[PDB]
Design a protein around this ligand. Structure first.
Ligand SMILES: CC1(C)S[C@@H]2[C@H](N)C(=O)N2[C@H]1C(=O)O
Length: 354
């Protein structure tokens, strides 16, 4: 998988990403444009203006992230609004559709916690998956898997903070709220899960709906959110946390979950069952993500035309004890690629600002 090392100012960071992933970003934009057009009757000109409005929000509220977005645009030779689109894709898509009309686990264990997910989506995006190592002086070094062009997704940092992301569809949109991928980046720049929690909350409200898990070797929490609800998931009596694509927590009376997939319930029940017979070993933990019960709608999801629109596109396993993330591209039953991410002393020097 394309691996880009980004360092320096926010703009320089964005620029390296944009330059080195130029052709991949073009594919990301193409795919996003197709997806977006499927959700709306609006003309492209109107869509451009909405994106200009969203860009102005990011510029005002998170100038550091906007500067990076500007760098990505410059390096990829694309319009800033196109990159803004990539970084607000879910929110943008949700909003347009309203106008018109993943399996994750954390296990606390004696020889170190284990945390992981499968990311399930349209297969077209798998070829657009890249990884970035981002060094910013005085902040944790981040290593994360993302679709080319997007500044926050799934990964971990030199401080041991590991993040996971699940689609969730509670109703509501706040265009001035924090986009999900910005919140992911905020979590990835934090030195602990507690700080991550604090800094996400600091934003004063989410733009839309998703689920985010943040953990290290000691503690972990999940967040189920809408623009009007932030509910915290904690470890159960077994030191476990499981999440799929539906609300497990009680939200306010006004909250409304929109068309979650039936298999989201099946997969959660399945993973909890699997973790019951789980012996604690890293080998067995890795095998959980290859489960094919209820195929093609399984934990290891398969694309099957006329049944399931997506597949598991990657799996990540955080070995908290060793601060290593094992990544398997494609379906864990037969991965396209497998590699281990780890921080070296240079990554650590940047984090210390030494
Ligand atoms: C296309 C997807 C793989 S993406 C969404 C969620 N991750 C899930 O499961 N789905 C599938 C769906 O919406 O059919």
């Amino acid at each position: 998988m394309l691996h880009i090392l980004c360092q320096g100012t926010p703009f320089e960071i964005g620029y390296e990403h944009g330059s080195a992933a130029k052709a991949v970003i073009a594919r990301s934009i193409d795919f996003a444009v197709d997806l977006i057009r499927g959700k709306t009757k609006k003309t492209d000109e109107e869509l451009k203006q909405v994106l200009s409005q969203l860009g102005r929000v990011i510029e005002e509220r998170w100038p550091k992230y906007y500067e990076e977005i500007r760098g990505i645009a410059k390096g990829a030779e694309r319009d800033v609004s196109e990159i803004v689109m990539l970084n607000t894709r879910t929110e943008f898509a949700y909003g347009l559709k309203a106008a018109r009309d993943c399996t994750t686990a954390y296990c606390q264990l004696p020889n170190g916690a284990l945390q992981g997910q499968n990311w399930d989506f349209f297969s077209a995006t798998k070829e657009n998956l890249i990884r970035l190592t981002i060094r910013q002086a005085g902040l944790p070094t981040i290593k994360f898997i993302t679709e080319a062009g997007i500044i926050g997704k799934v990964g971990f940092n030199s401080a041991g903070v590991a993040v996971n992301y699940n689609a969730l569809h509670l109703q509501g949109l706040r265009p001035t709220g924090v986009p999900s991928h910005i919140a992911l980046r905020i979590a990835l720049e934090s030195t602990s899960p507690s700080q991550a929690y604090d800094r996400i909350v600091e934003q004063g409200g989410m733009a839309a709906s998703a689920f985010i898990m943040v953990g290290n070797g000691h503690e972990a929490f999940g967040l189920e959110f809408s623009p009007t609800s932030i509910r915290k998931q904690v470890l159960d009596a077994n030191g476990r946390m499981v999440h799929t694509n539906h609300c497990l927590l009680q939200h306010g009376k006004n909250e409304k979950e929109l068309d979650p997939l039936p298999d989201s319930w099946n997969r959660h029940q399945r993973m909890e069952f699997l973790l019951d017979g789980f012996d604690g070993t890293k080998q067995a933990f890795a095998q959980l993500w290859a489960d094919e019960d209820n195929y093609p709608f399984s934990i290891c999801r398969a694309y099957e035309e006329g049944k399931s629109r997506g597949a598991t596109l990657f799996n990540i396993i955080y070995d908290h004890a060793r601060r290593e993330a094992t990544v398997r591209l494609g379906r864990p039953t037969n991965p396209d690629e497998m590699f281990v991410m780890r921080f070296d002393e240079e990554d650590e020097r940047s984090a210390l600002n030494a």
